[PDB]
């Protein structure tokens, strides 16, 4: 059972941000879904929630600009944030309360992996993937892209897990972002890079 999150990635100010949280696989009967957000380098901030009886609660700051709803035919919870500014840039999480509480933060037993939202006027750019070639290092460099995330870097489609260090992205003087993933292996290696905001899906072999 998973909470698959979906969003546009990067949006411009004054736009309306639309995020979806789909319940993959069926689980409990009366579960509730709450939306939290985490600005860069800051703590967790409760946006809202919807209970097992569809009772929708909003935090004090969200009452005038957030709409939360459910599509039961899709098992898809929807969050809309209107008139976004750069202050709305954050990683947005949806989480499940197994008790069905639409306004409780003390027992969120299942979280989505989160979806990134960057509110800026700068244009989206797709990255270039550069290979980097008893134990030796190798890896891949995802270079010159915007916005930062959603961005995914896997190795051998998830088969290679041990020794894999994916570094935090850095903002270059070019104004773009650069990330690097490295694996140290004993002396087929393919890195799968997926930048959703630019629809860049590249599998590069090192």
């Amino acid at each position: 059972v998973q909470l698959v999150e979906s969003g546009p990635g990067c949006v411009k100010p004054s736009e309306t941000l639309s995020l979806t949280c789909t319940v993959s696989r069926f689980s409990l009967i009366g579960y509730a879904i709450t939306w939290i957000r985490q600005p860069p380098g800051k703590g967790l901030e409760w946006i809202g929630g919807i209970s097992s009886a569809a009772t929708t609660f909003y935090s004090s700051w969200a009452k005038s600009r957030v709409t939360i709803s459910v599509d039961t035919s899709k098992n898809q919870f929807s969050l809309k944030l209107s008139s976004v500014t750069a202050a709305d840039t954050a990683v947005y999480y949806c989480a499940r309360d197994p008790r069905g509480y639409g306004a409780a933060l003390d027992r969120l037993d299942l979280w989505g992996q989160g979806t990134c939202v960057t509110v800026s006027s700068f244009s989206t750019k797709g990255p270039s993937v550069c290979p980097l070639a008893g134990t030796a290092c190798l890896g891949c460099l995802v270079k010159d892209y915007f916005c930062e995330c959603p961005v995914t870097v896997s190795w051998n489609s998830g088969a290679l897990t041990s020794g894999v260090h994916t570094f935090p992205a850095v903002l270059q003087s070019s104004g773009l972002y650069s990330l690097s993933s490295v694996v140290t292996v004993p002396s087929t290696y393919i890195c799968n890079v997926n930048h959703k905001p630019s629809n860049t899906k590249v599998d590069k072999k090192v």
Binding site: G43, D106, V182
Partner: protein
């Protein structure tokens, strides 16, 4: 909205550590939970309803307290416990619920010297105008490490970025990636490219170099 204490702490593997969570209002029906968030990951519910452990969470974690004062205790601190810990409380059923400000937990271990790898730019990405040399410092502690870039033994500055992984959940070490960015012309002008690493685990700076070609 809820106070946490301390803002960040550090201890050694096996130490007992305590994080306090304080509130103005009293918690309704013992609705107080403790979440653990590791780097690049969603928060994970460790403790719910003040003192009940989530299934799978090691017994090293425990929760206590009541009313407005709560405590999360890690009895035997491990490298995998590196995270930011939050408390979350509900004070009624009308929407009065909030998180704590958070508390970072670092783990201290012995000094560990890094392993230095160097990567020349790929010919595929050399087809554009930028060449990027990648220096890698693998499995080192403490975090403080100096990475110097040399091009034909000429010292570079302002044309390099770097990032560090978080504390490894198994050996408490760090890893750093440094990227030197030059124009393709400047790259084809010079041959020797080196990164010199200075870390207190090394008796002398360790230089990794390659000759273009």
């Amino acid at each position: 909205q809820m106070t946490q204490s301390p803002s960040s702490l550090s201890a050694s593997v096996g130490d007992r550590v305590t994080i306090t969570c304080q509130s103005i209002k009293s918690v309704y029906n013992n609705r107080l939970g403790w979440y653990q968030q590791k780097c690049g990951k969603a928060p994970k519910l460790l403790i719910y309803e003040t003192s009940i452990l989530t299934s799978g969470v090691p017994s090293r974690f425990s929760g206590s307290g009541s009313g407005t004062d709560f405590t999360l205790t890690i009895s035997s601190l491990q490298c995998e416990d590196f995270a930011t810990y939050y408390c979350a409380g509900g004070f009624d059923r009308s929407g009065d619920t909030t998180f704590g400000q958070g508390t970072k937990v670092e783990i201290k271990r012995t000094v560990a010297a890094p392993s230095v790898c160097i990567f020349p730019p790929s010919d595929e990405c050399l087809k554009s105008g930028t060449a990027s040399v990648v220096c890698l410092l693998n499995n080192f502690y403490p975090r403080e490490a100096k990475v110097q870039w040399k091009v034909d033994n000429a010292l570079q500055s302002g044309n390099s970025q770097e990032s560090v992984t978080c504390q490894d959940s198994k050996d408490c070490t760090y890893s750093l990636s440094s990227t030197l960015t030059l124009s393709k012309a400047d790259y084809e002008k010079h041959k020797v490219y080196a990164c010199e690493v200075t870390h207190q685990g090394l008796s002398s700076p360790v230089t990794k170099s390659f000759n273009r070609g």
